[PDB]
UniProtKB/Swiss-Prot annotation, chain A:
Entire-sequence positions represented here: 585 to 992 of 1893
Chain segments annotated as coiled-coil in the UniProt record: none
Places the protein is found: Nucleus
Disease tied to this protein: Dystonia 3, torsion, X-linked: An X-linked dystonia-parkinsonism disorder. Dystonia is defined by the presence of sustained involuntary muscle contractions, often leading to abnormal postures. DYT3 is characterized by severe progressive torsion dystonia followed by parkinsonism. It has a well-defined pathology of extensive neuronal loss and mosaic gliosis in the striatum (caudate nucleus and putamen) which appears to resemble that in Huntington disease. Intellectual developmental disorder, X-linked, syndromic 33: A syndrome characterized by intellectual deficit, delayed psychomotor development, delayed speech and language, and characteristic facial features.
Function: The TFIID basal transcription factor complex plays a major role in the initiation of RNA polymerase II (Pol II)-dependent transcription. TFIID recognizes and binds promoters with or without a TATA box via its subunit TBP, a TATA-box-binding protein, and promotes assembly of the pre-initiation complex (PIC). The TFIID complex consists of TBP and TBP-associated factors (TAFs), including TAF1, TAF2, TAF3, TAF4, TAF5, TAF6, TAF7, TAF8, TAF9, TAF10, TAF11, TAF12 and TAF13. TAF1 is the largest component and core scaffold of the TFIID complex, involved in nucleating complex assembly.
Comment text on domains: The Bromo domain mediates interaction with histones that have acetylated lysine residues at specific positions. The second domain also recognizes and binds histones that are butyrylated and crotonylated.
Protein family per UniProt: Belongs to the TAF1 family.
Protein name: Transcription initiation factor TFIID subunit 1
Region spans: Histone acetyltransferase (HAT): 1-376
PTM description: Phosphorylated by casein kinase II in vitro.
Curated annotation (Swiss-Prot), chain B:
Expression by tissue: Expressed in all tissues tested.
A cellular component annotation (GO) from this entry: transcription factor TFTC complex
Taxonomy of the source species: Eukaryota, Metazoa, Chordata, Craniata, Vertebrata
SUBUNIT field: Component of the TFIID basal transcription factor complex, composed of TATA-box-binding protein TBP, and a number of TBP-associated factors (TAFs), including TAF1, TAF2, TAF3, TAF4, TAF5, TAF6, TAF7, TAF8, TAF9, TAF10, TAF11, TAF12 and TAF13. Interacts with TAF2C1. Component of the TFTC-HAT complex.
Protein name in UniProt: Transcription initiation factor TFIID subunit 2
UniProtKB/Swiss-Prot annotation, chain C:
Record's protein name: Transcription initiation factor TFIID subunit 7
Tissue: Ubiquitous.
Residues bearing PTM Phosphoserine: 129
Subcellular location(s) of the protein: Nucleus
Biological process according to GO: chromatin organization; DNA-templated transcription initiation; estrogen receptor signaling pathway; mRNA transcription by RNA polymerase II; negative regulation of DNA-templated transcription; negative regulation of MHC class I biosynthetic process; negative regulation of MHC class II biosynthetic process; negative regulation of protein kinase activity
GO molecular function: DNA-binding transcription factor binding; histone acetyltransferase binding; nuclear thyroid hormone receptor binding; nuclear vitamin D receptor binding; P-TEFb complex binding; protein heterodimerization activity; RNA polymerase II general transcription initiation factor activity; TFIIH-class transcription factor complex binding
Extra remark: Overexpression of TAF7 in HeLa cells inhibits cyclin D1 and cyclin A gene transcription and causes the cells to accumulate in early S phase. In contrast, depletion of TAF7 from TFIID complexes by siRNAs increases histone H3 acetylation at both cyclin promoters and stimulates cyclins CCND1 and CCNA gene transcription.
Family: Belongs to the TAF7 family.
Originating gene: TAF7
Organism: Homo sapiens
Keywords assigned by UniProt, alphabetized: Coiled coil, Nucleus, Phosphoprotein, Transcription, Transcription regulation, Ubl conjugation
Full-sequence range covered: 9 to 187 of 349
């Protein structure tokens, strides 16, 4: 007639990326980054086109896109109201991730090179942490973007004041305090493609403070590092087998050698050692056909193999490897594998961090340094 | 997209019933349908009608000609000498498909008059006025007329519409499909002292000009199918719900306080189902009718539910409150997702049954706790795997035979066996739990809200189906709505667990590699059994090592056998630290039984029941004891209890005794540990040291501190030590000595529990505890030592059994003067007399049970007595008792009793196909073939039960014992 | 294949910024004729022509890193591109010291750690290439010379 389940003795007490991001599609998640592409990591230069309308030299008209924005927003609202009116998932194609539609905000970073950084196509949430005032409080100061949550226990290193609302980017990679600023009155946003220039205005720009890392960047030559390289190569090989049209499912080796050119012999073809067999006689010659007993994994199994956040941690590791390599122990402490290990260990309560040090990304007294100190 | 199989579209139907005669069991009425032809040259219109005598039919007030033929009255010809069951199953499927309204067909074929052909070619409205009469219906609408004198309201006579699925053709002519939605107008002219309850809202109630009868007018503006239209006419006591005011509860006279107490919880069920879904209750009223001699225990129609009165309990009745509570809950779940959103075909029934069962399981989770939810899910999964390994498999969503491994056709609901229908609903709600496991619960509730919101925007239009078919769900529409809200499609999961009809069997064994610190699992599947299929997906395994609980995902492809997973340290055995559990807590474990070289404490293959599986894991006995003690999952504690019966070591006795002593364990685990401890105690006789098992524990928990053999006076206010107290002597009576006879220390203990029982002080009744005491007395009976087939008389009775017989005589006679709640002690004493007759103690005479199986008794007494007669005619090979049972199947007033007799005679058959018996004549084959062909033609559940009985007795081929 | 889009910021003089803003928020294709951008083969020089009036432009490097973040529900934000360059209209000259927001001004001089930026290694490659032509090499300590 009651509960009668002794639950207090048995049980004592989210981010959805785009379908191009969870499927690790090449443009957005690169297979190989060279040295000049690792120096320009997250700072991509303005490339000159060889073919297209902008490849011909001369003046080029920019095109306003406000009929396009409101047409796409009205179309997405029709899709949402036709599907029952709830919240929908829209980012299903690469053409959904253009800047030509939707409400764009900008997000500037305080640090030069953060320990973790999102790739194109990945999602993040805005959480407004609001500590109520002692006793009576009016309610969270309302904010245009994000959802509000009442935080008794401060997520960040410091603690919120009573009656202080702090917005923050929250995802699987990090959590970082963001501060809304209005845009300058002179700056517009030009989206250039091969066909022409397009212009939006911006009105909202956030400044992102020092990140609190939630994912540990692996070290170089680590076991997690080599495991991610092997799993990424295996996922790319499976997706090339899925894309193959000729049954018995066959791929070419120099497609994989074009994708992963730093990979040597054994390494790149130890994933072709299993699942594939080198047909070189008669038909399918010089192809790696799929074995007939091998069941090619489904889409959800391939998604469960490698996560996009592991790819971002690997990209952070190899970019920091390049920067350290170019600059000939203080710098090694500022490497993201050390700082991410230090911060995550401090969050479990293993150890403490010297908050003033050399891992400080500001170079002055502002900002923290995530390097381990003993709790003694 | 829904395209009708009918060439017309039905818009509105008026059902008027006059002259409900209770003495003659007769109704008169008419039916007026408003159809729009969709194809020109409509000519014949085919409607559904059974048992109604059609007087006249007028189309647009012009006299029309009809022809009636029902091929399902006599399925095969009388002069065909076929006697195999595959012939009858194909002929019965063809006969049901020939009256199917889901094809274009129907039983009543009306011919459109000639002058209306220019009205039908350019597609204009046709109004068909049939007037009919039910003369004395067999299973159409049930007349319960008691034989007390007085007026029909003074004796308590009532009518209700009984049947399952499309059975509204049995009391008025209609288009009896779930896809023909129309609006309704229902008038019933009943006696002035009676009330007529039906679907819709009651717009008025006018008197007749003599003021001796009154007409109830109902209107249903939400477009429902004909199959969801019901009726209950009787002298009901009306009770408006004091919390929700559109909900009226109707009971039989003198049962108003039971109705007040019983239906006082229902507003919380309404609030739950309207806050997990975000739609309000779609109908404008809700009516719960409690009746006598019900067809099923709970039936749900549009804006109405019909329960039996045997669910009504008072405030002092426990062990019946959760069962009635969950019957109300599943009736409301079917109100949301069986009556508002309806089916598009007979396929896509798994969608509706799965959504109903799944949201009812969510209600059970919130109400009775997650632990009761896990226990319920595990018992449903064990039920399905037992049924699918027993016979073939349940196929949700077949494609039109698709399932030829069984003996009936799955094309229509009225050819299904009743056990297949039950397992169909069970598998549908477990597959919906699997879809929730792949796509999270909030997205699942968003799917259900999107279906309900499409249906409720559809439900307010007036266009005749230009939008009323958005109230019908299909499989493709359900998967498309899932893909709309989530972006993932479930087509591999749908292809494996819906379209394929099988469960999987896992055999696991591990080995710990000490050198490389790995755990080598070995999981092999039995995929060559008749009910099984091969699993190739991922598989979760949970390993509890000394460093904590870790989950691993294994990829089990066809050629896979050995899975190497890594193991952690064993540094919590260097220092004594607490070992962290599956939840956030940590406990002190006694690590003396553990191996020195392995850190792992237990392994669980598929802990979350994420596949439809049967696991056979080979752990060591100390791992099963650690999993019984320190696990924070009730299904793992239950499976460790189930696996400790093979290890009768005293450490397992200590484990189960520590589980039994432990409050803050879930009570249904301790109730299982009682029976496991009884089995282990029976297996380690000539090793057992002290007293019998659980006796000292019973005197420690439930008896006085100063008197060990006097039980404490009954205070049943804890509801967990009440269940444990009433289940512990029942397991304690299974204690077996070296001579194989129950010890006289446990029998004397049970008799002292019976004598010193005082219930004048608790606020709850004692009927279930005393009934379990009779069950414990029946468990102690060992077979008697008859010499030279000596006649069992009173002098050569066992000295043990004379005390038992005196106690059950006292209990049954005191029940004759002071009755229990549902004659629970009558049922227990009849069961115990059958136990004493099954051994050589009481003479094997069925006359007592034949007197308790008469019509005027309570239905629980009737089914207990008929179970005893079925067991007697199995053991004594009685011909006249089998003819008695078959006669009672043919002509009994209560159809639930007929279905139960066929069910019990299928479960405990008098002979199987392998047996040579004296009861395998050509006469019995001819009787059972006549019972399948004719005789059971009026119920659709007796005919499937007769098909099941013929399959159990004679098999799928020609009866062998025949010329 | 897919090529990551390249977004940059265009800064205009304030009156020309007001005319361009009015023409953008209007939304006609009349703006397309009015606003053109010609980037010179230097790579760091241009003309932006507002209403056919030429303005001189420089493509500069920004000290911080900005990221465009799109959203559909204003609760979850997806990163679309990285912005590091600005075509201000009116080498060391092509480096901007200030940031776009008001709190960030001369972030490069005051709020940036001076570990380093970049040049020295391209010169090393050129030096190794010149070294390739050597038979007798002479190198010394050198003092105040």
């Amino acid at each position: 007639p009651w509960n009668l389940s002794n639950d207090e003795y048995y049980y004592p007490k989210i981010i959805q990326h785009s379908i191009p991001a969870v499927e690790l599609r090449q443009p957005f998640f690169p297979t190989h980054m060279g040295p000049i592409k690792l120096r320009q990591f997250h700072r991509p230069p303005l490339k000159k086109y060889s073919f297209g309308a902008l490849s011909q030299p001369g003046p080029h008209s920019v095109q306003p896109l406000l009929k396009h924005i409101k047409k796409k927003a009205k179309m997405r609202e029709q899709e949402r109201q036709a599907s029952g009116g709830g919240e929908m998932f829209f980012m299903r194609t690469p053409q959904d991730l253009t800047g030509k539609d939707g409400d764009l905000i900008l997000a500037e970073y305080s640090e030069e090179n953060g320990p973790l950084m999102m790739q194109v196509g990945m999602a993040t949430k805005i959480k407004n942490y609001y500590k109520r005032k002692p006793g009576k409080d009016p309610g969270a100061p309302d904010c245009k973007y994000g959802e509000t949550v009442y935080c008794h226990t401060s997520p960040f290193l410091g603690s919120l004041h009573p009656g202080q609302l702090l917005q923050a980017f929250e995802n699987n990679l990090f959590r970082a305090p963001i501060y809304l600023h209005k845009m300058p009155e002179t700056d517009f946003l030009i989206i250039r493609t091969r066909q022409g220039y397009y212009i939006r205005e911006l009105v909202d720009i956030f400044v992102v403070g020092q990140q609190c890392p939630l994912f540990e960047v692996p070290g170089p030559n680590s076991k997690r590092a080599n495991t991610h390289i092997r799993d990424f190569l295996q996922v790319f090989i499976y997706r090339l087998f899925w894309k193959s049209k000729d049954r018995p499912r066959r791929i070419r080796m120099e497609d994989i050698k074009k994708a992963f050119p730093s990979h040597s012999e054994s390494s790149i073809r130890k994933r072709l050692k299993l699942c594939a067999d080198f047909k070189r006689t008669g038909m399918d010659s010089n192809w790696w056909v799929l074995k007939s007993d091998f069941r090619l994994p489904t889409e959800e199994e391939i998604r469960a193999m490698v996560s996009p956040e592991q790819c971002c941690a690997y990209y952070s590791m190899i970019a920091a490897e390049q920067r350290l390599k170019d600059a000939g122990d203080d710098e090694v402490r500022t490497a993201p594998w050390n700082t991410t290990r230090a911060f995550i260990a401090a969050m479990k309560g293993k150890c403490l961090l010297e908050v003033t040090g050399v891992a400080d990304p500001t170079g002055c007294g502002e900002g923290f340094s995530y390097v381990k100190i003993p709790n003694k | 997209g829904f395209e009708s199989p009918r060439p017309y579209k039905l818009t509105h139907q008026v059902v008027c019933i006059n002259n409900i005669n209770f003495q003659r069991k007769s109704v008169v009425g008419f039916v007026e349908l408003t159809i729009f032809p969709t194809v020109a040259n409509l000519n014949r219109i085919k409607l559904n009608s059974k048992q109604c005598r059609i007087y006249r039919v007028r189309i647009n007030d012009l006299e029309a000609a009809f022809i009636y033929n029902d091929p399902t009255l006599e399925v095969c010809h009388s002069e065909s000498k076929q006697r195999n069951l595959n012939y009858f199953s194909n002929a019965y499927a063809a006969a049901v498909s020939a009256v199917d309204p889901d094809a274009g067909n129907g039983e009543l074929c009306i011919k459109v008059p000639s002058e209306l052909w220019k009205h039908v070619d350019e597609l204009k409205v046709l109004k068909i006025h049939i007037n009919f009469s039910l003369d004395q219906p067999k299973g159409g609408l049930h007349f319960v007329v008691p034989s007390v004198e007085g007026s029909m309201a003074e004796r308590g006579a009532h009518v209700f519409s009984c049947g399952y699925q499309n059975s509204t053709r049995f009391w008025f002519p209609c288009v009896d499909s779930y896809s023909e939605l129309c609006t309704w107008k229902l008038e019933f002219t009943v006696d002035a002292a009676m009330v007529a309850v039906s679907n819709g809202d009651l717009v008025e109630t006018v008197y007749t000009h003599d003021m001796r009868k009154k007409t109830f007018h109902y209107m249903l503006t939400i477009p429902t199918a004909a199959s969801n239209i019901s009726l209950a006419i009787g002298p009901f006591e009306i009770l408006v719900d004091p919390y929700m005011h559109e909900v009226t509860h109707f009971c039989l006279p003198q049962l108003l306080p039971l109705l007040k107490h019983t239906t006082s919880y229902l507003h919380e069920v309404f609030e739950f189902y309207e806050e997990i879904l975000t739609c309000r209750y779609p109908y404008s009223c809700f009516k719960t009718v409690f009746i006598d001699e019900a067809y099923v225990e709970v039936a749900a129609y549009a804006s109405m539910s019909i329960f039996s009165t045997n669910l009504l309990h008072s405030a002092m009745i426990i062990d019946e409150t959760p069962l009635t509570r969950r019957c109300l809950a599943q009736s409301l779940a079917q109100q949301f997702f069986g009556c508002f959103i309806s089916r598009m075909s007979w396929s896509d029934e798994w969608v509706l049954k799965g959504i109903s069962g799944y949201i009812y399981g969510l209600w059970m989770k919130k109400t009775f706790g997650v632990n009761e939810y896990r226990h319920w899910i595990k018992e449903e999964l064990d039920k399905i795997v037992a049924y699918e390994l027993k016979t073939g498999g349940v196929l949700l969503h077949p494609i039109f035979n698709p399932a030829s491994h069984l003996h009936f056709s799955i094309k229509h609901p009225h050819t299904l066996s009743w056990e297949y229908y039950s397992m169909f609903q069970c598998k549908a709600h477990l597959v919906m739990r699997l879809i929730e496991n792949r796509i999270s619960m909030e997205f699942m509730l968003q799917v259900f809200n999107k279906l309900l919101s499409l249906a409720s925007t559809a439900s307010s239009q007036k266009f005749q189906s230009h939008m009323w078919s958005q109230m019908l769900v299909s499989t493709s529409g359900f998967l498309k709505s899932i893909s709309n809200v989530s972006g993932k499609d479930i087509q591999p999961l749908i292809k494996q667990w819906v379209d394929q009809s099988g469960v999987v069997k896992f055999y696991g064994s591990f080995a710990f590699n000490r050198k490389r610190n790995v755990l080598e699992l070995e999981i092999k599947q039995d995929y060559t059994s008749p009910g099984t299929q091969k699993y190739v997906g991922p598989l979760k395994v949970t390993v509890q090592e000394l460093d904590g609980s870790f989950n691993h995902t294994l990829q089990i492809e066809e050629n896979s056998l050995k899975h190497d997973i890594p193991c952690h340290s064993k540094s919590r055995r260097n220092k004594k630290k607490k070992i962290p559990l599956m939840n956030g807590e940590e406990v002190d474990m006694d690590l003396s039984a553990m191996d020195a070289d392995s850190p792992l404490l237990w392994i669980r293959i598929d802990p979350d029941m994420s596949v439809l599986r049967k696991v056979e894991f080979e752990q060591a006995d100390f791992m099963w004891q650690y999993q019984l003690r320190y696990e924070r999952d009730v299904v793992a504690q239950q499976e460790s209890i189930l696996a400790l019966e093979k290890f009768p070591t005293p450490a397992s006795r200590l484990a189960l005794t520590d589980i039994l002593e432990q409050e803050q364990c879930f009570y249904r685990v301790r109730m299982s540990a009682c029976f496991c401890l009884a089995k282990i105690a029976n297996s380690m006789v000539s090793t057992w040291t002290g007293p019998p098992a659980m006796k000292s524990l019973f005197t420690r928990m439930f008896c006085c501190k100063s008197c060990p053999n006097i039980v404490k006076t009954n205070n049943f206010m804890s509801f967990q030590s009440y269940f444990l107290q009433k289940t512990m002597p029942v397991a304690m009576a299974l204690l077996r000595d070296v001579h194989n006879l129950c010890p006289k220390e446990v029998l004397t203990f049970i008799l002292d529990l019976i004598k010193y029982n005082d219930n004048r002080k608790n606020k709850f009744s004692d009927n279930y505890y005393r009934a379990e005491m009779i069950d414990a007395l029946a468990n102690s009976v060992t077979p008697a030592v008859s010499v030279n087939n000596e006649v069992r008389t009173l002098d050569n009775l066992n000295p043990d059994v004379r005390l038992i017989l005196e106690e059950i005589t006292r209990f049954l006679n005191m029940e004759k003067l002071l009755p229990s709640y549902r004659h629970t002690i009558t049922v227990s004493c009849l069961r115990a007399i059958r136990v004493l007759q099954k051994n050589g103690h009481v003479p094997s005479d069925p006359a007592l049970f034949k007197s308790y199986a008469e019509y005027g008794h309570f239905v629980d007494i009737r089914i207990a007595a008929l179970e005893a007669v079925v067991d007697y005619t199995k053991v004594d090979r009685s011909y006249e008792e089998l003819q008695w049972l078959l006669n009672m199947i043919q002509n009994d007033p209560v159809p639930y009793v007929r279905h139960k007799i066929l069910n019990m005679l299928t479960k405990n058959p008098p002979f199987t196909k392998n047996m040579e018996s004296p009861l395998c004549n050509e006469a019995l084959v001819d009787q059972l073939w006549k019972l399948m062909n004719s005789g059971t033609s009026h119920d659709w559940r007796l005919r499937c039960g007769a098909v099941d009985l013929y399959f159990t007795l004679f098999g799928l081929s020609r009866p062998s014992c025949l010329p | 294949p897919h090529e990551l889009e390249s977004q940059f910021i265009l800064r205009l003089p304030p009156e020309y910024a007001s005319t361009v803003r009015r023409a953008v928020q209007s939304g006609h294709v009349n703006l397309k004729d009015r606003l053109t951008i010609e980037l010179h083969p230097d790579g760091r020089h241009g003309i932006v022509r507002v209403d056919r009036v030429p303005l001189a432009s420089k493509l500069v490097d920004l000290p911080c890193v900005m990221e465009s973040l799109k959203t559909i529900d204003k609760k979850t934000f997806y990163k679309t591109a990285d912005i590091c360059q600005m075509l201000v209209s009116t080498e060391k000259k092509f480096i901007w010291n200030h940031g776009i927001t008001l709190p960030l001004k001369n972030v490069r001089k005051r709020r940036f750690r001076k570990t380093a930026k970049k040049d020295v290694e391209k010169e090393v490659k050129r030096l190794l290439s010149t070294d390739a032509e050597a038979v007798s090499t002479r190198w010394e300590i050198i003092a105040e010379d």
